[PDB]
């Protein structure tokens, strides 16, 4: 399927144990997609002071359209030293590995895969 319904655990930035997906734009997009498929991907909501506490390159989920079955349609955009790889809508948050942190909420998304 071109899209997959996912419920992403929303993590507090200070709880996150693994603060990025790797060391290159291509690697972080690769790893983000693998973790989304394996159900091992978390979401951190972006506010003042969040991104400097995480590791670049960043992987964002961005709204790709204006929400089937309550799932917002999203795609992946990476960012490294202020340059983004991909073009999309509003940021829903930054993706990180999930390694058993307790979430505060869930974010239902339809991931363009």
Cα separation, 58 vs 26, in Å, equals: 11
Counting Cβ atoms within 10 Å, is residue 14 exposed (0-12), middle (13-18) or buried (19+)? exposed
The label of the residue with tokens 């394996």 reads: 38
Residue 58, beta-bridge partner list: 79
CATH architecture assigned to 3-112: Roll (2.30)
Greatest CA separation found in the chain?
36
């Amino acid at each position: 399927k071109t899209h997959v319904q996912l419920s992403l655990p929303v993590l507090q930035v200070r709880d996150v144990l693994v603060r990025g997906f790797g060391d290159s734009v291509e690697e972080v997009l690769s790893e983000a997609r693998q973790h989304l498929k394996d159900g091992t991907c978390g979401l951190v909501e972006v506010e003042k002071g969040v991104l400097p506490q995480l590791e670049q390159p960043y992987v964002f989920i961005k709204r790709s359209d204006a929400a089937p079955h309550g799932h917002v349609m999203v795609e992946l955009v990476a960012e490294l030293e202020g340059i983004q790889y991909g073009r999309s809508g509003e940021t829903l948050g930054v993706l990180v590995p999930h390694v058993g942190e307790i979430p505060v909420a869930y974010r239902k998304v339809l991931l363009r895969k």
